[PDB]
Amino acid sequence: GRIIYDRKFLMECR
Amino acid sequence: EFPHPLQDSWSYYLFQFRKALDWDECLEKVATFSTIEDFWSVLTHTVRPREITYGKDLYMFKSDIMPKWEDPKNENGGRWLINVTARQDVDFLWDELLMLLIGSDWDTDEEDRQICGAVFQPRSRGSKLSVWLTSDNEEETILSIGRRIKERLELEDTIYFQPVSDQRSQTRGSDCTGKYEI
Numbered sequence: 247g248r249i250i251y252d253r254k255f256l257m258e259c260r
Numbered sequence: 261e262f263p264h265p266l267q268d269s270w271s272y273y274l275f276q277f278r279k280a281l282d283w284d285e286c287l288e289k290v291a292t293f294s295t296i297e298d299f300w301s302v303l304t305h306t307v308r309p310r311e312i313t314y315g316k317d318l319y320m321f322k323s324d325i326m327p328k329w330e331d332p333k334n335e336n337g338g339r340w341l342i343n344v345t346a347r348q349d350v351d352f353l354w355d356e357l358l359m360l361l362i363g364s365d366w367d368t369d370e371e372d373r374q375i376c377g378a379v380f381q382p383r384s385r386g387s388k389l390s391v392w393l394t395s396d397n398e399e400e401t402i403l404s405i406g407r408r409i410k411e412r413l414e415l416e417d418t419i420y421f422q423p424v425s426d427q428r429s430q431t432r433g434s435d436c437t438g439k440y441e442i
């Protein structure tokens with residue numbers, strides 16, 4: 247299972 | 261707050277030219293990261309694209325892949341080349357590009373497999389962003405990657421896919437085509 251994060255989630259983490 | 265692991269481990273390099281160093285000796289590895297948290301920490305602790313001095317470049321590559329043509333994963337590959345326009349924010353372009361790569365936000369496993377790394381090159385005559393791919397002849401995958409890059413970076417101008425062979429033979433200062441274009 248490839249680990250995928252969209253930009254919305256990544257930015258929320260930022 | 262357990263860290264969020266990435267699909268891949270990545271390494272981040274600065275290219276800084278000094279006299280009498282070979283090209284590859286001007287590269288230095290400033291971080292290796294494998295979590296969303298450490299990805300963002302690298303960016304917060306290194307120079308922003310909009311602040312970088314001309315000719316000092318940023319390379320982000322899957323950790324097992326050296327950021328140079330000579331790597332087995334790069335030697336038969338090619339890059340999507342993006343010519344930055346005056347109106348574009350290079351901070352946005354770089355951040356969106358790296359998010360797309362480290363988040364592996366491609367439709368298919370196969371596209372992710374093609375990915376080697378990304379490069380930011382600030383230049384007086386016009387800056388360049390690139391994504392390096394492992395092959396030069398997986399047309400369908402290469403094209404879907406190019407299409408996704410344009411979407412995520414909100415690019416209007418044509419982007420160019422240039423095999424390593426063409427990159428090697430390119431003359432510094434020549435004014436732009438590709439094996440594929442979109």
Ligand SMILES: C[n+]1cn([C@@H]2O[C@H](COP(=O)(O)OP(=O)(O)OP(=O)(O)OC[C@H]3O[C@@H](n4cnc5c(=O)[nH]c(N)nc54)[C@H](O)[C@@H]3O)[C@@H](O)[C@H]2O)c2nc(N)[nH]c(=O)c21
Pocket residue numbers: 276277281282283284286314315316327328329330381383430431432433
């Ligand atoms: C990716 N790559 C590049 N070179 C080599 O770098 C040159 C410039 O590329 P470039 O992509 O920086 O082109 P321009 O922007 O036109 O250069 P420009 O704006 O003129 O320069 C950008 C920055 O790079 C510096 N620089 C440019 N050419 C060289 C070079 O041949 N050796 C060294 N040490 N520094 C260089 C320059 O001082 C400035 O800081 C290429 O023609 C290749 O010879 C690579 N060599 C090897 N062996 N393996 C690689 O993977 C490789």
